[PDB]
């Protein structure tokens, strides 16, 4: 029987057969003191605090590791167990140097919660006052080793969840220390992706986020709002802690999902730091090198006068943000795409989105879903990063890649003209030279699928022939390979179709569709395409005397788009913050709801709609964003007609599986 029935502390409990005693414990209600069990990470049996006794059997066994067997009597609280747990906690306090007076985590420490619960009004064991090093070389994380219980929840979360296996144990016995690469400092480490998942796993204040120390405590939080990171497409699930109108700590829920809560640097370090930025909250005006405070009537008048003298002669554009919700983008489409009919509206990453959705479009004609979910690159056998740097595009995809190619025996092979994104993890490096390399790759894949030749495609690709045949061999020999399309693959939209067609060639089929997993820079990608993305690139290569650019100033902006904005002669930015790269190229600088004072829905390339929640409500009164769009519609000869949010119906649908043909270009 899978459903087994036990008795923990008298209370009857129900569990699956393979579940450990801790699983059937945390399933119903009952509390067992644990310090080294992180929901997710495989039960590590180090703290020995979860020890429970079975009736009749006079010995004690860990509840985290011992399985539940079909009916048995578990006792968790009595005198002997309390004594042994207090002794374990006191050993931890006596061995390492624990000073709670100045610890960032005094209120969250799980060694402190347990100590107070077991009434530890002493240490009993002699205090060994040995000198463990305080590694605070990293400007973002600090590792104060004299608080380290040695639970390996940081080695395990950097070995099995992040993959960039930076932390391991150093020596044996008492001298065992948690070290970075080759016993060096965290800053000196080449393999730390600066993720912070080591800080979310550490229960004992050793690893702490420095910038938000003493504020990002979970006990002193005013609210706890669950939402979705809006910085990248992976859309990690987050548990933002709010303390007096600012986010102080962003820990990622989803320890049961394949990602495992390892939010990236941009999410554990830019999301709380963005709640403490300059926040204009009053319409400015340039005046020459320094802004002056203007009223909304004055600023919108000076920004609409420049929008009427520049709309008669076409000379007008709009660069909205793809980190905006579908409500805001639908509003912007109501003004820009429909009311005044500008064909010069873009989305600050329009090149990437339009390349992706003009390379994938052949397969939409053929009737297949030419992308799968990133969590399927964890069970693959050969990963091919084509024109990708997943550490700067979607770091959870990079972490999946690393976990696969280290703890699950995969192989990496790159087809990029760049720095080999995983320098020391790829087995075969290709550096395809610039020019026109897409239809020759088409020929190569047409070979790889039809033959199961490369001589002409090699010199045609501008590549040496031996390595071009090794590519084909290692591509056919794989039993479930996956491809990682990059954003750089979208400057020429046919390269993306070459990538997808190579996926059809290499027998890479998954239940969702093809194994290409496009690295979208933005979360609202399909939402941006249906509402703002222009079918032709116009930025840079067209004058555009006026430019309304909406920039939720979160993600680093392509520097080519910023230059194009700087040569415009009137730029109306509606950025929420006063960050550097936007207050320089701006003449008006209106305010905005700043990603945490608005809610939205974010329909994505993979179909389903997410939900962004209002983390902290607005402080001032921008009073709308529709008011700005209306005052633009006013004295311009156009109306607005607020539409409904266009239902995102997943344009790419999988009506075919493991049955596609290649596309000629």
């Amino acid at each position: 029987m899978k459903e087994i029935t036990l008795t923990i502390d008298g209370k009857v409990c129900k569990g699956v057969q393979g579940d450990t005693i801790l699983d059937v414990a945390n399933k119903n209600d009952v509390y067992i003191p644990t310090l080294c069990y992180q929901k997710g990470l495989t039960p590590i049996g180090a703290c020995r605090m979860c020890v429970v006794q079975l009736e009749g059997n006079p010995k004690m066994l860990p509840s985290c590791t011992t399985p539940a067997q079909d009916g048995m009597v578990v006792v968790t609280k009595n005198e002997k167990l309390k004594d042994y747990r207090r002794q374990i906690l006191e050993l931890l306090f006596a061995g390492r140097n624990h000073f709670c007076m100045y610890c960032s985590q005094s209120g969250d420490c799980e060694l402190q919660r347990l100590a107070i619960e077991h009434e530890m009004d002493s240490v009993r064991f002699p205090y060994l006052y040995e000198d463990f090093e305080v590694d605070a070389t990293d400007p973002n994380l600090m590792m104060d080793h004299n608080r380290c219980v040695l639970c390996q929840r940081c080695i395990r979360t950097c070995s099995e969840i992040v993959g960039a296996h930076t932390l391991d144990l150093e020596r044996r016995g008492w001298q065992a220390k948690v070290i970075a690469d080759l016993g060096k400092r965290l800053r000196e480490s080449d393999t730390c992706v600066n993720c912070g998942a080591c800080a979310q796993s550490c229960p004992t204040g050793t690893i702490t986020i420095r910038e938000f120390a003493y504020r990002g405590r979970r006990s002193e939080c005013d609210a706890v709002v669950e939402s979705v990171c809006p910085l990248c497409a992976v859309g990690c699930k987050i548990k933002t802690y709010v303390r007096t109108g600012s986010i102080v700590r962003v820990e990622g829920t989803g320890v049961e999902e394949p990602d495992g809560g390892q939010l990236c640097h941009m999410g554990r370090w830019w999301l709380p730091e963005s709640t403490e930025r300059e926040r204009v909250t009053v319409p400015l005006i340039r005046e020459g090198a320094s802004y002056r405070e203007a009223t909304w009537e004055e600023a919108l008048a000076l920004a609409s006068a420049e929008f009427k003298k520049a709309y008669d002669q076409e000379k007008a554009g709009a660069i909205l943000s793809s980190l905006c919700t579908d409500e805001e983008l639908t509003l912007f489409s109501a003004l820009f795409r429909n009311a005044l009919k500008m064909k010069h509206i873009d989305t600050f990453d329009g090149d990437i989105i339009r390349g992706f959705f003009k390379g994938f479009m052949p397969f939409r004609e053929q009737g297949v879903r030419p992308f799968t979910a990133a969590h399927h690159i964890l069970d693959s056998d050969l990963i091919i990063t084509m024109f990708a740097d997943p550490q700067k595009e979607a770091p959870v995809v990079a972490s999946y890649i690393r976990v696969a190619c280290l703890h699950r025996n995969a192989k990496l092979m790159n087809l990029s003209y760049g720095p080999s994104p995983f320098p020391g993890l790829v087995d075969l490096d290709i550096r395809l030279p610039e020019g026109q390399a897409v239809p020759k790759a088409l020929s190569n894949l047409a070979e790889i699928i039809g033959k199961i030749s490369i001589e002409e495609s090699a010199r045609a690709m501008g590549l040496d022939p031996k390595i071009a045949e090794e590519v084909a061999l290692m591509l056919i020999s794989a039993r479930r390979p996956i491809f990682i399309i990059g954003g750089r693959a979208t400057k020429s939209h046919e390269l993306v179709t070459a990538a997808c067609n190579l996926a059809v060639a290499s027998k890479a089929f998954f239940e969702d569709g093809l194994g290409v997993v496009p690295l979208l820079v933005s979360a609202n990608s399909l939402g941006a395409r249906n509402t703002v993305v222009s079918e032709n690139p116009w930025l840079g290569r067209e004058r555009r005397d006026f430019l309304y650019v909406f920039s939720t100033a979160m993600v680093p902006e392509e520097e080519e788009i910023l230059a194009a904005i700087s040569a415009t002669r009137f730029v109306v930015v509606q950025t929420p913050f006063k960050v550097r790269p936007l207050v320089n190229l701006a003449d008006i600088l209106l305010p905005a709801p700043a990603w945490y004072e608005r809610s939205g829905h974010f329909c994505t390339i993979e179909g389903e709609r997410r939900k962004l929640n209002t983390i902290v409500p607005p402080k001032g009164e921008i009073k709308s964003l529709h008011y700005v769009m209306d005052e633009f519609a006013k004295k311009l000869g156009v109306k607005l007609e607020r539409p409904e949010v266009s239902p995102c119906e997943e344009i790419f649908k999988s009506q075919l599986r493991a049955s596609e043909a290649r596309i000629v270009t």
């Binding site: 391991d168 044996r172 070290i179 690469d181 080759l182 016993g183 280290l406 020391g424 993890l425």
Partner: protein
Amino acid sequence: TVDVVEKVKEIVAPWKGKQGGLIPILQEVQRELGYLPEEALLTISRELKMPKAEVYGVATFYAQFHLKPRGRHVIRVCRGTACHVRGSLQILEKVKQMLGIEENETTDDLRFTLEPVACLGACGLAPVMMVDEDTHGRMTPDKIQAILDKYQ
């Protein structure tokens, strides 16, 4: 510096694509080079595509690996049960205070090194104080000088 990059890159060749084999892959660079420099472990991690942290953890987890240059003559004293009940601790502490160096480290100029071992086998002739070449059966407190000057 270039002497330590291909010798380690060649001993790893018969282990590429084979599961396991970091304990032997190191026991060979130890026997060749005398120690495991940081360059050695770095190239092992590069070639096997094993994490550097794991390589350093295995290299520092086991006793018979030395990450620093070991001496040209080891001074293995036996701290086994038979020698200790006989009083080998006295011999150990006097070679300690005589070389003046810490418990398990090398001399300042790489001449000797103290390495307390397990039973070297002469649990009859106890205590044994091997000086990197041969057994030494009795080793009372006064017989330690007549050998430590000889082998240097």
